[PDB]
From a paper:
Methylation on the ε-amine of the lysine side chain is catalyzed by a family of approximately 60 lysine methyltransferase (KMT) enzymes. [name] has been reported to monomethylate or dimethylate histone H3 (H3K4me1 and H3K36me2), p53 (K370me1), RB (K860me1), MAPKAPK3 (K355me1), and numerous other proteins. In addition, small-molecule inhibitors for a variety of clinical indications are currently under development for [name] (21). These therapeutic efforts are primarily based on the biological connection that [name] methylates the tumor suppressor protein p53, leading to inhibition of p53 function.
K-OPL analysis of [name] substrate selectivity revealed that the optimal substrate is not found in the human proteome (WKLKSKR) due to the tryptophan in the P−3 position. Replacement of a substrate’s target lysine with Nle has been previously used as an inhibitory strategy for KMTs. As a proof of concept for K-OPL–guided discovery of KMT inhibitors, we synthesized Nle-containing peptides based on the optimal [name] substrate and found that the Nle derivative of WKLKSKR inhibited [name] methylation of PER2. The unresolved amino acid in the P−3 position was modeled, and all-atom MD simulations of this structure in complex with the peptides used for in vitro KMT assays allowed us to evaluate the dynamics of [name]-substrate interactions. MD simulations showed that the tryptophan settles in a hydrophobic pocket near the [name] active site, and a recently found small-molecule inhibitor of [name] contains a bulky aromatic group that also binds in this same pocket. Thus, the K-OPL screening platform identified a [name]-substrate interaction that would never have been found through the analysis of previously identified [name] substrates. Overall, these results suggest that optimal substrates identified by K-OPL screens can serve as scaffolds for further optimization toward more potent inhibitors.
Author numbering:
A (entry chain C): -1 to 3
B (entry chain A): 5 to 433
Write the structure that this text describes.
Amino acid sequence: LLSKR
Amino acid sequence: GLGGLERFCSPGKGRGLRALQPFQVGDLLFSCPAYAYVLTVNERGNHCEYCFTRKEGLSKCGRCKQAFYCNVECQKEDWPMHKLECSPMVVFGENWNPSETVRLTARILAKQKIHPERTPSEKLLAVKEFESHLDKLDNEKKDLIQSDIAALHHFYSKHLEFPDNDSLVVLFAQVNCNGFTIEDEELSHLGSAIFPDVALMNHSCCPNVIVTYKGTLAEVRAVQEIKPGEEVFTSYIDLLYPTEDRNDRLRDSYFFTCECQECTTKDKDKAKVEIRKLSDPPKAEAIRDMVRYARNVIEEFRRAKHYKSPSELLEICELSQEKMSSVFEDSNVYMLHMMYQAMGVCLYMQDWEGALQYGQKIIKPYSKHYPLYSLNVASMWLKLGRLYMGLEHKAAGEKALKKAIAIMEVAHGKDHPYISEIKQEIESH
Ligand SMILES: Nc1ncnc2c1ncn2[C@@H]1O[C@H](CSCC[C@H](N)C(=O)O)[C@@H](O)[C@H]1O
Ligand SMILES: [Zn+2]
Ligand SMILES: [Zn+2]
Ligand SMILES: [Zn+2]
């Protein structure tokens, strides 16, 4: 899902 | 709706979020309470199930012994959701292993049953309205969704009233397309959640806002000046990688191709894939070959961390870094990737010196490849600072911690609890 990493 | 903002139709990007007032760097655009959320298994005992508060002395649920709360109040408030798993966990015992996505989707169905009306999490966009990309779904993805549905029926049939298979495929597609992972100050995975109003924002590789979390509350703050009429963009992915990689991930997971300034101009691609300045410069095909190798080792390592030992993982990192270093510069993002993975392995082994050693090599290229305010950069500075502090190096530690604070004040807001904790760390030592 939407994550920065 | 939401003050100073509005839903609108963004040409070529479906529905989006638009500003109706100016926003300055660090300003809070809006907050969104989680519609549905689940704490990841590995963080149980560290965080409260209900509010995600990180604390010592959390009270254990007497029945399942696998849920922890701040107090009896958090326990009670969490029960409508926890009951979906409490007895099932003890009954299935070791066999209880649904994926996080399934757990979240179960909680979504439960919320839909209890509260079918529009929630305060849906002021601009409703869960029912989520884009699914059902029509774009290939066989591999339909098979994965079917496995997920089967797991849902397998572990959650006790309290849930299921729609037909078609609606479940739609729901699962919506969850994959709009779901958020929640990370802590170190970008460590905490859990998964639905934030409908937040999911309205479209993607850009040069976003003007960042999403952070305050317990289960999502917060959206500007990292660039926003003027009335401008669309509000957030980043869905890790912005370290070059354009092709980024778009491969966006196409695979979100079914679209980005056309932002970064993807069009490709400005940072050269520096991201920096080549060594050798007497005999490396041929084009040798570059393409090493890039291909780099993506392959990234995927290979991804698989290997599930079953290989820490020494084997470090071997893969060292050896791959060695092979890549003949062509790629240390500032090259694939080198950085391996270095970061290796740092993680060192950290697990409680080899603090090695982790510091790698992080020092990682931090500056991160600063140059990532946008001005980046959680990845702040998080790296924070890790470095905590390692320095743990290793009794207060000046270097204080410096790195203050760099982290400096970014986080913008992204999380000056009054965020994470910053209070960091300042407490600086003052205590
Ligand atoms: N930069 C972009 N260009 C084209 N489509 C985008 C985009 N960023 C996000 N999207 C679309 O938005 C979806 C993410 S959920 C974002 C809200 C969505 N636009 C909606 O109408 O509900 C993705 O599936 C993708 O199709
Ligand atoms: Zn709590
Ligand atoms: Zn329980
Ligand atoms: Zn882009």
